[PDB]
Design a protein around this ligand. Sequence first.
Ligand SMILES: *[C@@H]1O[C@H](CO)[C@@H](O)[C@H](O)[C@H]1NC(C)=O
Lengths: 29, 49
Amino acid sequence: KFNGLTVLPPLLTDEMIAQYTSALLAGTI
Amino acid sequence: NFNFNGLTGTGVLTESNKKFLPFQQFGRDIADTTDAVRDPQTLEILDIT
Ligand SMILES: *[C@@H]1O[C@H](CO)[C@@H](O)[C@H](O)[C@H]1NC(C)=O
């Protein structure tokens, strides 16, 4: 849309980050 | 490189689903960037991506 302003996606997507916090919770628990 | 009546912009045009009021000629985005035009010969709305 923008002029040459573009947005890169993050390397770790939201699902994977949810998996990392799931791993941390399962480990903690 | 489209030139609607005074809107000289460079974009791909798409078959929009926007409903301009009868007197509104071109659409505008939040940050003052043109999003759509009314083709003045067929009163249909084209988006500019
Ligand atoms: C322009 O003329 C064409 C016929 O050549 C017609 O189909 C079209 O509706 C006209 N445009 C407007 C805005 O009436």
